[PDB]
């Protein structure tokens, strides 16, 4: 009940989660806005919200166009609230030499909520910093999928060398908050192929402790 959609030159994975009523939740629309918008329209899906795992430039480049086209709210953790509009904070200037920004701040700011309901989609919310200070992971129990951004990938873990990066915090997020989830849970991460909690527990070389 979701699609992984790599977008932009970085090929960061956006996700569209949907239901049988053709309503949808968008995660991390990072680039190539027109490819994402036209796909949603071809599929006759009605998006309800944009949920951001974090505000690095490669996850936000299509936010303006998607937000404007569909008149939907943007959710982001308060610790990164300044990052959307500031290219000196979100990595674009430093990592690519060009500024990437939104034109408006997020209209919903997350803090310590453990649950979030978007229409009839309910998520458990975990604050999972280490790759970035406002990184959050959205667990959708109904279809056993975790939209965890750049914390945990297939065969690797998030880089901890960017603004506010902290490897000691990232490993705690992984061991204490992500890996206790059910082993069949799909890890729908920001970069690379899908995986599951169980597969990474057994085979991710950065997770032998
Ligand atoms: Zn990132
Ligand atoms: Zn990323």
Q: Which ligand is nearest to the CA of 83?
A: 1
Structure tokens at 28: 């991390």
The reply, when asked if residue 175 is annotated as ligand binding, is no
Residues 42-62 as b/e (b if ≥16 CB within 10 A, e otherwise) read eeebebbbbbbbbbbbbbbbb
The reply, when asked if residue 56 is annotated as ligand binding, is yes
Q: How far is the CA of 72 from the centre of ligand 2 (A)?
A: 22
Distance CA 145, CA 123 (A): 10
The reply, when asked if residue 59 is annotated as ligand binding, is yes
* Resolution of the structure, angstroms: 1.4
Neighbours of ion ligand 2 (CB under 5 A): 58, 150, 190
197 phi and psi, to 5 degrees? Answer: -55, -50
Q: In what order do the strands lie in the sheet with 136-140?
A: 115-118, 121-127, 136-140, 145-149, 186-189, 195-196
Give the other-Cβ count within 10 Å of 32's Cβ: 19
104 secondary structure, DSSP code: S
Dihedral Cα 107, 26, 176, 112, nearest 10 deg: 20
Distance CA 35, CA 4 (A): 13
Q: How far is the CA of 21 from the centre of ligand 1 (A)?
A: 32
Q: Would you call 34 helix, strand, or coil by DSSP?
A: helix
188 secondary structure, DSSP code: E
The reply, when asked if residue 150 is annotated as ligand binding, is yes
The reply, when asked if residue 54 is annotated as ligand binding, is yes
39 phi and psi, to 5 degrees? Answer: -60, -45
Distance CA 33, CA 25 (A): 15
The reply, when asked if residue 191 is annotated as ligand binding, is yes
Give the other-Cβ count within 10 Å of 183's Cβ: 14
Instruction: Spell out the alpha helix ranges (H) of the chain.
Output: 33-42, 63-70, 92-96, 167-172, 197-203
**Which CA distances in Å does 20 have to 27, 42, 86?**
18, 16, 38
What experiment produced this structure?
X-ray
Distance CA 198, CA 209 (A): 16
Q: How far is the CA of 206 from the centre of ligand 2 (A)?
A: 18
Q: Where are the domains of the chain?
A: 1-209
Strand partners, 110: 77
Q: How far is the CA of 151 from the centre of ligand 1 (A)?
A: 8
Q: How far is the CA of 19 from the centre of ligand 1 (A)?
A: 27
Q: Would you call 189 helix, strand, or coil by DSSP?
A: strand
The reply, when asked if residue 77 is annotated as ligand binding, is no
Q: Provide CB contacts within 8 A for 24, sequence distance 6+.
A: 16, 17, 18, 40, 45, 46, 47, 48
Structure tokens at 194: 């899908």
Inter-residue contact 79 to 112 (CB < 8 Å): no
Q: How far is the CA of 14 from the centre of ligand 2 (A)?
A: 10
Backbone φ/ψ region at 164: left (φ over 0), alpha (ψ -120 to 50), beta: left
Strand partners, 109: 76
């Amino acid at each position: 009940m979701f699609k992984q959609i790599p977008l932009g030159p970085i090929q960061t994975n956006a996700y569209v989660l949907y239901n049988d009523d053709k309503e949808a939740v968008i995660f991390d629309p990072g680039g190539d806005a027109e490819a994402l918008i036209t796909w949603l329209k071809r599929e006759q899906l009605t998006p309800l919200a944009i949920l951001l795992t974090h505000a690095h430039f490669d996850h936000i480049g299509a936010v303006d166009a998607v937000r404007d086209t569909f008149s939907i709210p943007v959710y982001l953790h308060t610790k990164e609230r300044h990052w959307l509009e500031d290219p000196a904070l979100n990595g674009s200037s430093r990592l690519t030499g060009r500024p990437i920004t939104t034109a408006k701040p997020a209209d919903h700011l997350l803090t310590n909520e453990k649950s979030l309901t978007i229409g009839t989609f309910t998520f458990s919310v975990f604050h999972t910093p280490g790759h970035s200070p406002g990184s959050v992971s959205y667990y959708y129990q109904k279809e056993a999928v975790l939209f965890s951004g750049d914390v945990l990938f297939q065969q690797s873990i998030g880089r901890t060398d960017l603004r506010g990066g902290d490897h000691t915090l990232l490993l705690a997020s992984i061991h204490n908050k992500i890996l206790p989830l059910p082993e069949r849970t799909i890890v729908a991460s920001g970069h690379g192929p899908l995986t599951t909690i169980g597969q990474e527990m057994d085979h991710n070389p950065f997770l032998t402790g």
